[PDB]
Amino acid sequence: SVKAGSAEDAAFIMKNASKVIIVPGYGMAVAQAQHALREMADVLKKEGVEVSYAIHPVAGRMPGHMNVLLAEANVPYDEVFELEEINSSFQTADVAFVIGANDVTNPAAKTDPSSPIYGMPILDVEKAGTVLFIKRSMASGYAGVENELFFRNNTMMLFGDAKKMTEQIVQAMN
Amino acid sequence: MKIAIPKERRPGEDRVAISPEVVKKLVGLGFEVIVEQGAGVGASITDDALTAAGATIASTAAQALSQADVVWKVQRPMTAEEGTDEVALIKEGAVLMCHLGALTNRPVVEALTKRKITAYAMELMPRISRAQSMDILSSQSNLAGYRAVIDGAYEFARAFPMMMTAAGTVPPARVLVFGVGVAGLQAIATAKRLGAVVMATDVRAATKEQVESLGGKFITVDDEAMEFRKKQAEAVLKELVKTDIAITTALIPGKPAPVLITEEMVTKMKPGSVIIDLAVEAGGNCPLSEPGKIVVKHGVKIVGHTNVPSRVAADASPLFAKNLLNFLTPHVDKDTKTLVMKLEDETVSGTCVTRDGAIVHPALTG
Amino acid sequence: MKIAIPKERRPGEDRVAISPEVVKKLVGLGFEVIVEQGAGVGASITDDALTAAGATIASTAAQALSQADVVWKVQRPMTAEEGTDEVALIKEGAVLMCHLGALTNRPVVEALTKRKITAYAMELMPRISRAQSMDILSSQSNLAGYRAVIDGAYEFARAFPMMMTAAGTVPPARVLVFGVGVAGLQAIATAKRLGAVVMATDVRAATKEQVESLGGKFITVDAGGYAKEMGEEFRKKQAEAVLKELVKTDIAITTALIPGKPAPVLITEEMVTKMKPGSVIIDLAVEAGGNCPLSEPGKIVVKHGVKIVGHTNVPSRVAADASPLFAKNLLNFLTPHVDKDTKTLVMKLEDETVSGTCVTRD
Numbered sequence: 001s002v003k004a005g006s007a008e009d010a011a012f013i014m015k016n017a018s019k020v021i022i023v024p025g026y027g028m029a030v031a032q033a034q035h036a037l038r039e040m041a042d043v044l045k046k047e048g049v050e051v052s053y054a055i056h057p058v059a060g061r062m063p064g065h066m067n068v069l070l071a072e073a074n075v076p077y078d079e080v081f082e083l084e085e086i087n088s089s090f091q092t093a094d095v096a097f098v099i100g101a102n103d104v105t106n107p108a109a110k111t112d113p114s115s116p117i118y119g120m121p122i123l124d125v126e127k128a129g130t131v132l133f134i135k136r137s138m139a140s141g142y143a144g145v146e147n148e149l150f151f152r153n154n155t156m157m158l159f160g161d162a163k164k165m166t167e168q169i170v171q172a173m174n
Numbered sequence: 175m176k177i178a179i180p181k182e183r184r185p186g187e188d189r190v191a192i193s194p195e196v197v198k199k200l201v202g203l204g205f206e207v208i209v210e211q212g213a214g215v216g217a218s219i220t221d222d223a224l225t226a227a228g229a230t231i232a233s234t235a236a237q238a239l240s241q242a243d244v245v246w247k248v249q250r251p252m253t254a255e256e257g258t259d260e261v262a263l264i265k266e267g268a269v270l271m272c273h274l275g276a277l278t279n280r281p282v283v284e285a286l287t288k289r290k291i292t293a294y295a296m297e298l299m300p301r302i303s304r305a306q307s308m309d310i311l312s313s314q315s316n317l318a319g320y321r322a323v324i325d326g327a328y329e330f331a332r333a334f335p336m337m338m339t340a341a342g343t344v345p346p347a348r349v350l351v352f353g354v355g356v357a358g359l360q361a362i363a364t365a366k367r368l369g370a371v372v373m374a375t376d377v378r379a380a381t382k383e384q385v386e387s388l389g390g391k392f393i394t395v396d397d398e399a400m401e402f403r404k405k406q407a408e409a410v411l412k413e414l415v416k417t418d419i420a421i422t423t424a425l426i427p428g429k430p431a432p433v434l435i436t437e438e439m440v441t442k443m444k445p446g447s448v449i450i451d452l453a454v455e456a457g458g459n460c461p462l463s464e465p466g467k468i469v470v471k472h473g474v475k476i477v478g479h480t481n482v483p484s485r486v487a488a489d490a491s492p493l494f495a496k497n498l499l500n501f502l503t504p505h506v507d508k509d510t511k512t513l514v515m516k517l518e519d520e521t522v523s524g525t526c527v528t529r530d531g532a533i534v535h536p537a538l539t540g
Numbered sequence: 541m542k543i544a545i546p547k548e549r550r551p552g553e554d555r556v557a558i559s560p561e562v563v564k565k566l567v568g569l570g571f572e573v574i575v576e577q578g579a580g581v582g583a584s585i586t587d588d589a590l591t592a593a594g595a596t597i598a599s600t601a602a603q604a605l606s607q608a609d610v611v612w613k614v615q616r617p618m619t620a621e622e623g624t625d626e627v628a629l630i631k632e633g634a635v636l637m638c639h640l641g642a643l644t645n646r647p648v649v650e651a652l653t654k655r656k657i658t659a660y661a662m663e664l665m666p667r668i669s670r671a672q673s674m675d676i677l678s679s680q681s682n683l684a685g686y687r688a689v690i691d692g693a694y695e696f697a698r699a700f701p702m703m704m705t706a707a708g709t710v711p712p713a714r715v716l717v718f719g720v721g722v723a724g725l726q727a728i729a730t731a732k733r734l735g736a737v738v739m740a741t742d743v744r745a746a747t748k749e750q751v752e753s754l755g756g757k758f759i760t761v762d763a764g765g766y767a768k769e770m771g772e773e774f775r776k777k778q779a780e781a782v783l784k785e786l787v788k789t790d791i792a793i794t795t796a797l798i799p800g801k802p803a804p805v806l807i808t809e810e811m812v813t814k815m816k817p818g819s820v821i822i823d824l825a826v827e828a829g830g831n832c833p834l835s836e837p838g839k840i841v842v843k844h845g846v847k848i849v850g851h852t853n854v855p856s857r858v859a860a861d862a863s864p865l866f867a868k869n870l871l872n873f874l875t876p877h878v879d880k881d882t883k884t885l886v887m888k889l890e891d892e893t894v895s896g897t898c899v900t901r902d
């Protein structure tokens with residue numbers, strides 16, 4: 001029933017990977033963490049790691065919500081991919097850094113046939129070795145349903161603010 | 175079976191309900207796709223470009239629709255009462271999909287009913303997570319929010335971003351966006367990337383967070399912290415007096431657009447300013463705006479273009495063709511090439527307006 | 541001593557050689573400033589604002605120059621035969637400063653020489669590093685590069701930025717800018733802001749660096765501040781790799797210029813013919829001939845599916861910003877010769893800022 005976790009831990013998990021894909025969401029926008037997030041990526045792909053962004057069409061609160069904010073942080077285009085063009089890669093990925101994203105990953109869209117988020121395509125985050133989330137609390141998102149991915153074997157819950165929770169990780173990353 | 179895409183006849187509609195990428199899908203789903211000639215021209219989608227995808231090119235609208243089993247359009251078809259009977263061109267018993275404007279255009283719905291045409295009004299798509307890809311309301315509005323900024327930039331006599339030059343410094347432009355739906359949100363983003371100071375204001379409380387998630391600044395009274403609060407419009411007027419470009423996106427279905435910037439308010443604006451009223455076809459958020467033109471009073475330019483989505487026709491159309499296809503595919507199966515709209519589906523029940531000789535949607539005198 | 545700024549009377553010109561801020565400075569130097577009533581209407585600079593700044597308001601243009609010791613303008617005065625004698629208003633013996641356009645306007649130069657008028661052509665300012673603050677070509681070029689992208693975005697039927705949507709992905713516009721000088725650098729910047737993938741090229745090699753720093757990719761090929769003709773040999777080697785990117789381009793902005801010689805053609809009619817349909821070309825060199833023969837000054841031309849824009853006096857399209865800056869270029873050029881409590885002007889001349897500019901100090 002829910003595993004916890006802090007920055008130092010999250011720094012560890014990811015700092016020990018060869019392929020890492022970021023999954024930004026509304027949360028990453030409310031906190032305006034694009035620049036922090038983009039750092040934790042170039043300091044990450046510094047070691048020689050491969051980085052990618054999984055952009056879900058309905059992330060944030062409006063079309064192209066994630067795009068404009070990533071574009072501002074100066075993250076390259078040829079490194080940002082749409083659900084359908086990367087949704088497979090998660091399997092061969094150790095970490096699924098989910099910053100501010102929730103409904104875009106909830107599995108209740110393929111299962112629980114009665115969920116508000118039912119039928120909606122999602123990102124195969126769980127197929128990733130370890131899935132690190134990030135969020136101020138437990139409350140759900142726009143949908144109004146809990147994420148069974150939240151509390152289960154391979155899942156982290158870095159409770160806090162996206163900009164800060166990323167800000168530190170970048171530090172304890174040196 | 176057979177599906178055809180005619181050219182849009184309403185004045186100024188440059189969009190077209192099809193795309194090269196979508197034809198390949200329609201063929202792959204079993205259809206024979208036909209599209210009128212010169213149909214995608216305003217959308218930069220040439221016939222050759224279209225044929226290359228598997229589409230045939232009928233020469234006239236009549237020949238295109240003649241024997242089509244499914245018909246795709248963007249705006250509703252014209253009736254005889256409007257000077258051109260387009261629903262007459264559609265084969266009896268066929269299926270029509272487009273932005274009907276059903277709840278507000280009973281006549282067209284009647285015209286369609288007389289020819290036993292099953293019509294699905296795309297604008298009535300259910301607001302459910304699984305129909306986000308079938309929502310034309312947001313794909314078009316989104317481009318309009320984008321274009322509202324581009325038009326405002328075009329009409330403004332100053333540059334959006336602040337510039338520090340050897341000869342001096344020029345301050346950024348100040349944008350105030352009224353109404354924070356899909357359109358308004360994309361306007362904030364486009365105005366902020368262009369380098370302007372962006373302020374916004376909407377009635378729905380939960381907005382402030384959305385606006386800040388785009389670098390915007392929400393207009394909230396600070397008499398305290400989060401009997402007559404109708405004096406918040408003093409904080410809204412405070413900003414307006416300093417605004418260079420005001421973009422209004424407030425609308426309400428069936429009802430007239432709510433006045434958000436009075437004539438009294440525009441007089442308080444600085445010369446050179448421009449107001450972009452995306453609500454101009456429903457009466458406007460500003461009473462000084464006029465459907466289809468840039469009026470000018472008190473030194474302020476009041477822009478009121480119609481059909482803004484069409485001003486971004488080349489990107490709007492492929493998005494629209496996508497919505498359409500995403501709505502249809504779930505109903506075209508083996509059955510040796512035949513579509514069947516499961517009446518169980520909420521996407522079908524909430525969008526179907528009339529079915530084989532009979533109005534069906536509740537809100538329509540039946 | 542008195543200085544006057546008239547309203548611009550040439551077709552289109554909405555700029556004015558003045559601002560509230562610049563009057564204050566002019567006043568403190570011992571100048572009596574008279575501006576023409578309604579002169580700043582195109583630049584949003586109001587009469588009320590100029591008075592508060594210390595200047596005075598004149599009813600007519602004629603009244604504005606009547607007793608002017610120095611006259612400031614944006615564009616060259618309309619000669620008697622041009623439709624209205626303005627050179628005839630400027631009081632005899634005074635000094636004039638503006639974009640007179642020396643070289644190509646030989647007559648207006650003599651009409652002033654006959655009215656015993658000393659005029660300074662601001663567009664002849666030397667390319668010395670200490671004059672950047674007084675260079676009007678630059679302060680206007682810069683705004684022109686911004687307005688190009690704006691005008692391009694306007695005429696373009698697609699959106700500029702990439703946006704991944706539930707209805708599919710709207711790809712980013714691909715912009716290509718020929719000529720990475722002032723106007724071109726800013727065109728790259730503003731284009732990069734709206735989210736477009738930007739492409740650029742220039743003959744001057746010191747460019748490639750600047751382009752890469754702004755966020756654009758450089759299309760490699762191969763004076764005292766500029767360039768000259770390159771020869772038919774190059775032009776052909778140029779349209780080489782340019783093609784690869786030009787047939788994928790949606791917006792093409794041409795800003796190439798070469799002093800005393802026709803603007804260099806960079807996009808022939810044979811190249812426009814190969815551009816995606818619905819593409820747009822912003823020709824900023826249109827008044828120097830243009831970089832694309834299809835462009836025609838003052839109007840938009842559609843040919844072969846490509847829209848070729850060639851507005852004239854683009855800086856005026858950005859009047860409210862262009863004017864303050866223009867007024868300051870003049871202030872920076874004059875201020876160094878106003879002998880502090882005497883209220884009299886003397887143009888250094890030894891200082892090349894006065895020599896490279898003075899056409900007729902009659």
Ligand SMILES: NC(=O)c1ccc[n+]([C@@H]2O[C@H](COP(=O)([O-])OP(=O)(O)OC[C@H]3O[C@@H](n4cnc5c(N)ncnc54)[C@H](OP(=O)(O)O)[C@@H]3O)[C@@H](O)[C@H]2O)c1
Nearest residue numbers: 025026027058061062063102103104135136137141142162
């Ligand atoms: N794309 C569109 O145009 C559009 C339009 C309308 C609705 N929607 C819907 O909205 C959802 C968007 O996807 P999503 O993944 O982003 O889902 P959410 O919108 O459902 O997820 C929000 C996540 O951000 C967190 N968050 C909020 N503030 C934060 C902060 N300052 N720092 C760190 N985290 C923060 C939230 O939890 P805590 O509060 O506990 O931190 C939450 O986990 C989808 O269901 C979509 O259908 C999209």
Ligand SMILES: NC(=S)c1ccc[n+]([C@@H]2O[C@H](COP(=O)([O-])OP(=O)(O)OC[C@H]3O[C@@H](n4cnc5c(N)ncnc54)[C@H](O)[C@@H]3O)[C@@H](O)[C@H]2O)c1
Nearest residue numbers: 667668669672719720721722742743744765795796797804
């Ligand atoms: N006061 C001083 S010191 C000053 C003032 C203005 C500009 N500059 C400098 O001069 C350079 C440019 O000035 P500018 O005003 O933009 O020049 P201008 O606008 O005349 O030149 C436009 C651009 O055309 C380019 N160009 C010309 N022919 C070709 C060709 N065949 N193919 C490709 N490109 C071509 C040229 O190199 C330049 O970058 C910049 O590097 C500035 O820094 C210095």
